[PDB]
Write an enzyme that holds these catalytic residues in place. Structure first.
Site, PDB file in Angstrom:
ATOM      1  N   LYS A 112      17.963 -44.824 -37.112  1.00  0.00           N
ATOM      2  CA  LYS A 112      18.520 -46.187 -36.998  1.00  0.00           C
ATOM      3  C   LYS A 112      17.281 -47.314 -37.255  1.00  0.00           C
ATOM      4  O   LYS A 112      17.768 -48.219 -37.407  1.00  0.00           O
ATOM      5  CB  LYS A 112      18.916 -46.398 -35.629  1.00  0.00           C
ATOM      6  N   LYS A 188      33.957 -32.548 -43.784  1.00  0.00           N
ATOM      7  CA  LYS A 188      35.097 -33.064 -42.784  1.00  0.00           C
ATOM      8  C   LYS A 188      35.227 -34.571 -42.806  1.00  0.00           C
ATOM      9  O   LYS A 188      34.427 -35.389 -43.144  1.00  0.00           O
ATOM     10  CB  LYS A 188      34.474 -32.753 -41.523  1.00  0.00           C
ATOM     11  CG  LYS A 188      34.205 -30.942 -41.045  1.00  0.00           C
ATOM     12  CD  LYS A 188      35.423 -30.511 -40.510  1.00  0.00           C
ATOM     13  CE  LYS A 188      35.151 -29.289 -39.802  1.00  0.00           C
ATOM     14  NZ  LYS A 188      36.224 -28.427 -39.407  1.00  0.00           N
ATOM     15  N   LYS A 191      35.186 -40.743 -39.622  1.00  0.00           N
ATOM     16  CA  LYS A 191      35.608 -42.145 -39.562  1.00  0.00           C
ATOM     17  C   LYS A 191      34.455 -43.033 -40.318  1.00  0.00           C
ATOM     18  O   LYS A 191      34.664 -44.208 -40.631  1.00  0.00           O
ATOM     19  CB  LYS A 191      35.541 -42.830 -38.080  1.00  0.00           C
TER      20      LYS A 191
HETATM   21 CL   LIG Z   1      34.251 -38.693 -37.128  1.00  0.00          CL
END
Ligand SMILES: [Cl-]
Ligand SMILES: N[C@@H](Cc1c[nH]c2ccccc12)C(=O)O
Ligand SMILES: N[C@@H](Cc1c[nH]c2ccccc12)C(=O)O
Ligand SMILES: [Cl-]
Ligand SMILES: [Cl-]
Lengths: 327, 314
Positions: A112, A188, A191
């Site tokens: 970050k 996969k 989000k």
């Molecule tokens: Cl996720």
């Protein structure tokens, strides 16, 4: 005694069918055999700058979405993190038993990263407090939070050596369905994807859902063959896995069903199966989300259950440390 | 109305007359010109390893001693930091508006609490809409961080915080060029008259022949320090003491200083032992102090949470 499971939910307002059919839907059916705690971590959210109005709305979005998915506030403890002061209280105490180098070498902190704030540096400690407050035995964790759960285990063990068996040492526990990215079936569904055409959100408009599934990548077999083969036919296998997860039909049954058919037929059935599943979830979501008095009562009762359990551990921590007990 | 003053008191219990007559006694007399807040900072104490029993005892020692010196729990707010959850709550929120480089550049700055305690100190202050903070020179940088974080938060969300401002010369008996803070340099407030007189007798003095009771910090540091101690206790100006000691030796000065200091300390000690051995009384003081502090602090915390975008706790 039932195992205690603690799960943090970012107040994003967004879940994917991967999150649901893979993890949350199964957990919904395990609320009677586990003591499930769901914490909407708005205090972790502000370690990155949040638009205030979006943050408040997304906290309620997430709550109504978990309720729509089937989390029962009577069987489980669901609450907003900032509503339970014990999380920040124990977070400060565990700072004093956490090494500076343990935080400075976290991958999330380097990933970050001079325009960085102390909350990004310190949020592993608050995460440990979230878990240890509830005598948590198991914590669902993705690969990215693995380093954070390890610190929570190290801090619990370090504290217990000094003061006695005050904390339970949490363990990772990941039990469902395999849901891959629509346009990249070897990755996969996540989000956090930049390409939203890879993802299907639980609150996504059905019209966009069918569009994305019709775009789903398949293979160049001539003639098309609908069979499950992850190595050679990742795209077709992914659509078969999603269809099986929604309808309960086994992969072999779907294969016989699609004997002689095109990938378009598989996409069509996947689209209407998923669209129907999101339709049921979205009907519940709008019921819950448009009744903010109901949401407030859920948050109030959830925070009271959470504080009642949490304050027992905090009081034991303060006594061991040597704070004068609050009269 | 009255300006708000916030003071953090480490749970140490062993104050000196230098602490008392320099800061705390004047503070005691200002409780009606200011809304004074005294916070016994046990959460800051555990940034260094603490023996549990000593920390618990020292928290109560500090409370009883502040009351004995005249801190009034009805006029002022006196409480134990850990009893008010709002301190840790705002402490976390303000971490997110503090730069990591601000904390690493701190001169005083190993566990994460020692690194992060300046943020908690800023929360301690800003919670109460504090106008003034009495800080030693060692904490000046900490107070400046609290000002920077308050202004930074206000610029983002509106004027939620007030920007705080910074708010008797007793020297070591054996080396009077350094302030009283080797306990022989020191006279604790809970020290028997026998020990006080012995330490004052060993206080360094000059070699003037004839010895003279005159105030001169350049050439007579030890004698001047004794005159300062006597002046602080009795209220007599040093020139008045010089006239009163004309023709007297340093044994006379030392005997007068010992009598005055012990007379002052017997008042404080009689009160300290009455309060300190009354567990029910101390619990009541801590209870009401925490309730007052939380009611005041929750107002700022709720405004902070609303500005940031949290759902209000229903
Ligand atoms: Cl996720
Ligand atoms: N850091 C987690 C959220 C979280 C906070 N506390 C937790 C405890 C358990 C699991 C997850 C969490 C995330 O970004 O996803
Ligand atoms: N750290 C301070 C105590 C303290 C905590 N918070 C404060 C706020 C203002 C002044 C002092 C404090 C000390 O050692 O003395
Ligand atoms: Cl493919
Ligand atoms: Cl000092």
């Amino acid at each position: 005694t039932k195992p205690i499971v603690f799960s943090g939910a970012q107040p994003s307002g967004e879940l994917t069918i991967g999150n649901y059919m893979g993890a949350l839907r199964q957990w919904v059916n395990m609320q009677d055999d586990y003591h499930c705690i769901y914490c909407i971590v708005d205090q972790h959210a502000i370690t990155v700058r949040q638009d205030p109005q979006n943050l408040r709305k997304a906290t309620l979005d997430t709550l109504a979405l978990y309720l729509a998915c089937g989390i029962d506030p009577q069987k489980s403890t669901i609450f907003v993190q900032s509503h339970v002061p014990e999380h920040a209280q124990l977070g400060w105490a565990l700072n004093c038993y956490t090494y500076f180098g343990e935080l400075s070498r976290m991958t999330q902190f380097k990933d970050k990263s001079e325009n960085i704030n102390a909350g990004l540096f310190d949020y592993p400690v608050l995460m440990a407090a979230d878990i240890l407050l509830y005598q948590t035995n198991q914590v669902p964790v993705g690969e990215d939070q693995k380093q954070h759960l390890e610190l929570s285990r190290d801090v619990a063990q370090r504290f217990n050596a000094i003061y006695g068996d005050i904390f339970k040492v949490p363990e990772p526990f990941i039990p469902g369905a395999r849901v891959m990215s629509l346009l990249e079936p070897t990755k996969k569904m996540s989000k956090s994807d930049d390409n939203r055409n890879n993802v299907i959100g639980l609150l996504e408009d059905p019209k966009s859902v069918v569009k994305k599934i019709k775009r789903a990548v398949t293979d160049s077999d001539e003639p098309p063959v609908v069979r499950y083969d992850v190595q050679n036919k990742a795209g077709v296998s992914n659509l078969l896995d999603i269809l099986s997860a929604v309808t309960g039909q086994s992969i072999p049954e779907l294969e016989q069903h699609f004997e002689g058919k095109m990938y378009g037929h598989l996409k069509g059935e996947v689209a209407e199966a998923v669209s129907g599943m999101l339709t049921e979830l979205q009907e519940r979501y709008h019921r819950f989300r448009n009744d903010e008095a109901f949401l407030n009562q859920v948050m109030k009762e959830g925070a009271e259950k959470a504080s009642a359990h949490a304050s027992k551990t905090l009081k034991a921590v303060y006594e061991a440390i040597g704070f004068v007990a609050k009269p």
